[model samples]
Target chain A: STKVVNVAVIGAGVVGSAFLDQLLAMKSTITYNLVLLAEAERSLISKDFSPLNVGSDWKAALAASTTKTLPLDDLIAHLKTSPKPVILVDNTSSAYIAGFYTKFVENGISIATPNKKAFSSDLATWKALFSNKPTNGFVYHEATVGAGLPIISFLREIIQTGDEVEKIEGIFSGTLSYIFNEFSTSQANDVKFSDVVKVAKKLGYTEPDPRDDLNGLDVARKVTIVGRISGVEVESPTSFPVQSLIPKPLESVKSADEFLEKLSDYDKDLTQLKKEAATENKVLRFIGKVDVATKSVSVGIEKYDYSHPFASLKGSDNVISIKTKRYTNPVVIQGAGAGAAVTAAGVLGDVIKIAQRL
Target chain B: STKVVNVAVIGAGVVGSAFLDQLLAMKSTITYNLVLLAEAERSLISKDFSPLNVGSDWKAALAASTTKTLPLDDLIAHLKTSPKPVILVDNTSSAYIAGFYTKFVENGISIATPNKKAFSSDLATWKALFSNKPTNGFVYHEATVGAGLPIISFLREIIQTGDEVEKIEGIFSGTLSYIFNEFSTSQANDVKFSDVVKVAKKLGYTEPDPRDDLNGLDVARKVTIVGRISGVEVESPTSFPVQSLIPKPLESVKSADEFLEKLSDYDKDLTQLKKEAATENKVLRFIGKVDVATKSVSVGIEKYDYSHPFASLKGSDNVISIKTKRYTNPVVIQGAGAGAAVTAAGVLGDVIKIAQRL
Candidate 1:
């Protein structure tokens, strides 16, 4: 029960840094040794599997270190040589690292990540990862769908404990949730869709490229992960209906700057749609839905009554409603779906869960 | 990692039966040995610590069993003699059984229960149970608060991972939620409070004695658990203010039937309150609140806007909104708060978590 868990964390980006910070502050019964901290081109490795001093100035230490980033095979070789159980923390959104998940687990190395590409990329990889699981190491990705919101954990508990999931519906993207929440208000107000999007971009709510947020694939990926977890044979993120918010005419814009400059040209279209929805006392919300019985998945803007939970949402909050056999009324979980700090807490929670098993 | 976990279930009522059914249907990675099954007056103990066949007709087997109920000390003695790690499944609401939790864990015996008395009884027991936790055996009581919802687990994650919980607000009682949900609505109509209470009691939605629910102590107990978990030094369930719905005149009623017969006497009072709330376009809801910063907890009826989540709650669903440092907007979890099946699933889920650690 006092076994020490060796951890190798890759990707020193915002979420990674936050994860390390939370790990530093964590008060747990399990012991953890952060043996490896790596970035894109450099790393800090404990050559003899000693515990590294992961202080607030870890980034400075990483930069001043002489160690270089090792290849995937070499990294696993070093992890396998650790004296204790090892956990691979893949903070990077790198498909290269995600592809090694099955192999890592086969070598008795656990994984915890926020990378969607690991589970939502393809059905085969998802199957392989679960099927090849070894007893000692486990995988948990709570931050994949709803960051820190307990969506996947609750769904897993429902499924694992013999509850039949009938349907899943939610507003998944923080960017889209914010944009639609501002554009559609319960109060009598006129708000422009393009103006909300521009404001969201300025406030760093949207991706560097607004099209990434508007393309609808992020929501689809999340839906795919949820679907696959619920036993749906989703082929891929784009296997079913996905209605993109990017205007058809600007679909081929060469750059995000060019796309933003021309975004107002199509604001009138959304204005007309919003007005029509208001005529029926409905509001527009970007929603992702999965009907488990029908095995169908969809992501698009849907109209909701003014009193609906989706319509009543505030800020960038994401709301997930899951209908199960026992819970006929649907279990709803709502909270922040994105952020480095919360996402880090989620990842560290996963780490502690795995470490407790050590 | 392939260790076998011994399970001793000590209850054969509705929740216990449902929990065993779920455990029988469970497909898990861990090995389990049902070493003992006990009811109120009788029991089936595996003297050799062998696996007992827990079939669908376990009730019949218990009735036909020759073994008599063992005393508390004798039961723990038997459990301690097991070759494998033992987990005591206390499905009853007996305060007598709850008193043995610290002793059980101290003897390296884990506990998983839906029993509220184990955690919310006294501040000293709460403190002792946590402080005396051994490395091998742990205690989990997720069903104590929200039948199958992820309330306790999420709160533990928030508190354990360095997030400061500001406040916790919710409709903690399914009976009260159903009572107020039907009593107050978005439609323009009159609903008599006594009529709703009578219907709820008839439907088995309320306690056998409706006055037990009306007294507000169940909600208070739930609040005490949440408040204590959030680091608020709540002494007991009744240490703080709790507004009971029992009319002052009926406080000393002879029986539940007598109380129900005379419940309509105060319908005029509630009707007037309802009308006044309707005048302001607000709806009534029974709410439980814990202000962590102020170190206060309360349970009582409150008013909410028509658009508020509490006002829009449907049927018997319970809603919990927790505000923390990282999540500026409260994380909301809404689901079924009571029912034998969901509560059983929660207990079984706790058992699985403990077994996984084993």
Candidate 2:
């Protein structure tokens, strides 16, 4: 018989709930004890170390529970108290939840998260997470950079097998990929940059504010993460060159409303570049570039020949191409980059790896 | 502190030597105890289970020693006495070594190999091997199909995550990919069908006997194996239509020399087909296809568009496109598929996975 691993999940957002649904269905292959479930308003933690019934009514159970979401200390203590192996599943974009990963891992807890806030931060934080990890604990975040595309894992294997990773280039942000591909098209007429940004925001592809995606920091962070892992010391998200699409005059706009109101006035300039790029057959992509030999990492606008893989991507598909000395032909992995079910599945793939080792 | 895994190697040919060279240098990641090294004619087994020194002079150490390769029974008995976990690394292409996998795995011994001989045999043998594997024993043969590509592991993850596999297509053979891509050039091909095969065979791209590659059985075997793994009950390699490049009259050629002397007579038929394909901007490729919905599996020479991924493959490069319901855009992996060092690296990648579990 297989021993059960206890799990404490923090976040009941789309990905969190979808993860529980998937985890419950995975009992046939392997067993995971849903010992704790936490969200912003409420938490249903197993006080007696019993497994909680994770079903369609998980939210109702959380709402009906008297116990509120535990403090960081309490959650860590609860996780540490598990008699068997413990896995902490973080499904939120919360920096608070991501920050506790070091402690959780140090306490013999494995982590599976799609949260990009932690690893994409300062270099010291990234170093601390890896260096301080207990031998037994593992941190897997395949969903951080390429979602379900196997980008991180592919890069890991290529490097681990003693191959030198030459470069990593990808269209990481599904939102930005769509904006650029649509903004630069075969035909001349297209929506303004802000209109596309607003459309992505409405589609739940952008962050709280569209500028968060427009400032190019998101793609830069992803590039930096890939660079560091490729044995290049990219200090932080903004450590190297990253070109922002935001207009200089509107950069200081206080509110998203002000930015949106004035974003169209600068469309003529952006449209001209797109027209040049799309002259024959070129498509614009928000690219994350990691050049290991040159120690260069950047995220910006790049006009790829339309025959390029970037030009062929479908609606919100994430694509990454890894160029290594051995894999000279490259490995291209693409799939749905965003979605609760897909993200949940990617995180579960990591959990399953940890479970196999445990 | 990590527990060490004891490994027994059962081949000392090119790949076996390369595997040792790579594994010995992988000390920073994990430790492996090379308890035994054997070839068909010789072996250097440690009776006391002391790890053999796999250094620059390993060949000299084997030459000076007086140990014979163990029989299947003796090997099984020796492995069963291991104090901890044991891993059997089969580096040979011998069916004799491959056939013993079921017995080894049943005795709580993990098996890792690049041999397709075992899996491509028959449906009954396939069932026996999988059914007999113990819970603690792993059967990993990632190097079987795409040599250095992570096709098997990627498919395993997609299936393990409860995703439905819609289709799988690829040019699985490094050798056939080269011959077809070269012989069916869009502009013009002065080289004949047999001429390309001879060139490939001379370059060590084809098997010991070039007909082994020309019969289409190798690709058919790969297709059937993939089809079976995709939840289709493919009976055998010959269960479906497989187009052979070998001419009917030349099928019974006495020797490689005789075959080459008379091969020119058959080139006109093939040249005409290539000429027809070139007019339509198409090139021929040995394609393996698996459709889960239709339960259809086949391997044949098919004409693909000049812009298809197959046309762009570099020298001896292998590419597989997996279409799953979730990944509508498909996940395509391309890389070096052959070579002692590259295949050795692929084997070590599996060993690392097993070490992580150990």
Candidate 3:
């Protein structure tokens, strides 16, 4: 008998819609019945566990639906009644939806998401989400860390095979990666740090507010998740030292314009740091590091010699170097860390993993 | 009731023994019943499909076994009679064993192997090995191309998710990677290629016959596997243009000693190439490249700018860069491509993937 997996997807934003398209485009042997499509404002639910014909017009169907955002209880109950195994794909950055991962998994619904909040919010929630183990439904969040860079899967394999992971360090943020790469390259003839950020903002590389990218919180969250996976008891994303690039004087600026206006005031401080690296023929790079033995997880700018891989990283690619007992030389995975297509592919890959198990 | 999987391992060599240790150390809910352990000369078979007590001294037991090597037909019949699902772990480079992959899978036996011969031998065999997939059994060979560096998994995901892979290139041979990195490094003042090869041979880095590593067949085999996986109809590993490093004069050399003694006679030719690269601030790297659009697969030495990742590659680590429609910057995976512990981990990881599916 053929087994068809029932699927429910929440979040209809960029990554979510892209995921729907990738999911529809997948050529698989196993059958997938899209039972629910949801967003912050509306949802399309299959009342009798029938497949939703999202086709190519899923966005239009989701738009015309009159239903409000799906409640956690109602969604779980609907999935529980399905005749086949269910998978819940979370595509939003909504911590509210992430808060219910334990509930969803406990109800025998698998999860595949790029939501870092679900895994890096707090130690307690992280523990609870994975407590059920092999007996319960599975959860795979490969995209939560490096957005399809094979970071999570590589780390998990290194650990599962009983290899001791010694250290993990990487450039995590696309925006910050761009900023520091442009500002600190030896070839960049005296480019100002603030000017680089300005160009990054103008090019739409940063968030709506550029401060979100400079605060260092996103890198810290990803580091926390990697640390926890490596068996470190990371209490929270902020538990470790994270050197925020947001200057102290501009932290309370009223708007992005004001922040940008005041950013150059601290250009000399960065120039001083860049000079320190230049003196040694090195480049500055913002990185997240996890030392398993020392139980230290931190995110900040660091200098890399010209011969190091970090010094030669191109564009805004995310690169992770992991040193383990077996791999003394460290395994590195590098690529575009953020994008609709790649991130959605990561989520869809996780879905296929769970579907194969079912 | 818990589902148990029956596992049979062949080839009690270095990689096979390491894989057994890793499998025994895994903490899992599903029980794995090891029913057979075999090598070239002898085997330990469980007559009634019971678990074999292959504790810490599996080497001693396999050494002491009096039974002859089990025939493929006999092993298949025994596995087919198991009350549980079966997985066959092939750790040998024997093309004879690889030829039976289709038969094993058709009997619902999954496969996990590091043997490149299984996938890169011929297009007919490669196609047949994967033809009975999904409905029959699964085959995973992550170690075939890049040891434990996530190369095959990354490529499979990129293709399965409908992302068009444009080009794939890398240093696939650790021996050649080290040889070139040492001989062509800017800091290697007048170091001859033969001197580097002698040092590598002394360090146990090259094969018993150094020519085995210098001939470039290993790289061609790996490139063939990657090309076929990427949807190119690569007829065979020898069907492409492979630039051998062996000097033409040494082709009929009587012995490795004579070959090494005579290799330096052509040092001036290599010195010419190295000087050409150094003149442009570049380094020479032995690489395998697959250009999908052009339908070309080649293995040879290529010059890379000082800032390229290939130029900065350290030690003997193998690095692969894959450019796809989504990954404009190319996704790169780098690590130690050859070692007992890491390669065993790759095979064990494949077993876990299949176990989860079963």
Candidate 4:
């Protein structure tokens, strides 16, 4: 007999869509009923963003036709009557609704999300969500830290088997890599700084607006998620000293051309930093931290030699080096850190894990 | 009612014993009618061998038992009575006998083996084994090449996804690493060559006498297995030129003194090679290859810069670099190549895969 597992995806964004694609692809290995819950007014049902229109919706759309475009309260009410063993994938990046993790868990749904806002908000909130005696199920966010590198999976396996994590250090940001790579290569060419950001955006390496990426908040959120998972009592991103690439808000800039016009002013500072790194034969990389020995958390740029794996990471790829007693050589996991499909696949991996456990 | 799966283990060596231990640990997941098959002459029926001796007598030893050690006729006769969907693990290293991969498949029994003999054989044998396979059966052998590194699993995944192999390279031989590490470190300490080999043997780094490993046949067999899995047509170790370290038969030497005399003479050659490499600021490493362009295979020692991953492999660690079109970057897998517990755990991983598939 073929057994069917019901899955609910909240937020039909890049990561959520990828999860749907993989769920559809692995239908034989895992039979699933997909309930897509997205905002009705947010254009999820539009032909431009439709999975079927993109030709990536075959498995997801064919599996189940129920698409709820209702508000969160109505969707939660709908979830109560559907079935048992339901998986909820929260791909929403909103910081306003951080307490929804407990709400989903209370509704008999296992939560899997790439949204770092909830996990990184408060240490107690993170602990309370996981530590509760689950009447419903479990939460897994393998994509929370390193998108496709199995960071949480590796950590869970190591810790489950009685291994202790002593320390961790590495690049944990795609935006940082984009900025560093662009900063390094931009000096030789007369191309405007805004032009590099445009290229990065086209490559899906940065957020929609360049300011969101350059402000370092994305990296700060990621490091806070890491600290939370590592069992550290971490404060919010505002508490961390993060080095920002953009010194001011770009609200005055109406267009990419206007942004480019403003970026020329910072070229001198960028050139000086690049030349200083070259003089010492070092590559500059942005790094986030949770140093256990000192119990300090910060985000900044560091100069590294060629031997370091972080220095070897190419464009848009992120690498995490986990230090532990069992692993004499640090377990270095490297892969694409940001992408709709890859991140979606990661969220789907968590979804499948939840389904199996259920 | 709990669903039960029948498992038959043929040849109770290190690999087979490990499989039994894992099956016992995961007994809750599976209700197994376990069968233990071995040669009558081998005293595996003892207390140390059968830790989970749940059943009283030899007949009750497993849910079933067979004592015919090496005769294929008796073994096949015993298997005929068992029901369909049986899990068989062939742990014998015998080349001629391991070719029964097809016969096991014909009987609707899935087989997993660490033995290189069957996989390293001619391509016809592989095709015959996999051609028009049964609906519910698999022939997986991750332990056949690179021990616990999941080399075969990675290759199978790539091949399944329509990826073609370009070139394969790595330090596939733990024996070679031990030999080279000992040879170089011994010279630095002014120790005799024979003493180093003795130390390596005592440390369980080399085969009983070290002749079989020193000749590079172990690596040749490994590369052959890789070639077969990668869909290359080359067959046998004789098809490629392998660099040999031992010119004379090791068995001919009656005493440690005799072996020491020959090693002392060879020590200067290794020492000179090491000195030349140090002068050029390089490290010597034993490398293996299966180049697809020329359809050639070879294994030998080479001096490499620190940038190469294989150059950094320490102790009994194995590193494999699989180059394929699908992988944007070379898929590299590195782990401990030799250890009873680790290798056993690897075999256990294969068993879990078989259980999942079943």
The best-first sequence of candidates by TM-score reads 1, 3, 2, 4
lDDT of 4: 0.63
Off by over 4 Å in 2: A132-136, A185-195, A198-204, A252-258, A278-281, B132-136, B185-191, B278-280
Tens digits of per-residue lDDT, candidate 1, A279-307, equal 98988889999999999999998989887
* lDDT (10s digit) by residue, model 3, range B102-164: 789888888998988878886887766777356567889998887887788887886777788
Comparison by TM-score, 2 against 4, better one: 2
Instruction: Give the per-residue lDDT of model 2 (tens digit) for A90-189.
Output: 9888787777777777778889888887888868778867773336478888888867657777667656667788888888887888887777765556
- Fraction of native Cα-Cα interface contacts (under 8 Å, chains A and B) also present in model 2: 0.44
Clashing pairs in 1: none
**What is the DockQ of the complex in model 3?**
0.71
Candidate 3 chain A worst ten-residue window by lDDT: A128-137
Q: Model 2: what is its DockQ?
A: 0.48
Worst 10 residues of 2 chain A by lDDT: A128-137
Question: Which of the two, 1 or 4, has more lDDT?
Answer: 1
Chain B TM-score of predicted candidate 4 relative to the true chain B: 0.84
How high is the lDDT of residue A188 in model 2? 54
In order, the candidates keep a fraction of the true contacts of 0.77, 0.44, 0.80, 0.01
Output the lDDT of residue B214, model 2.
Answer: 82
User: Distance (Å) between predicted and true CA of B332, model 2?
Assistant: 1.8
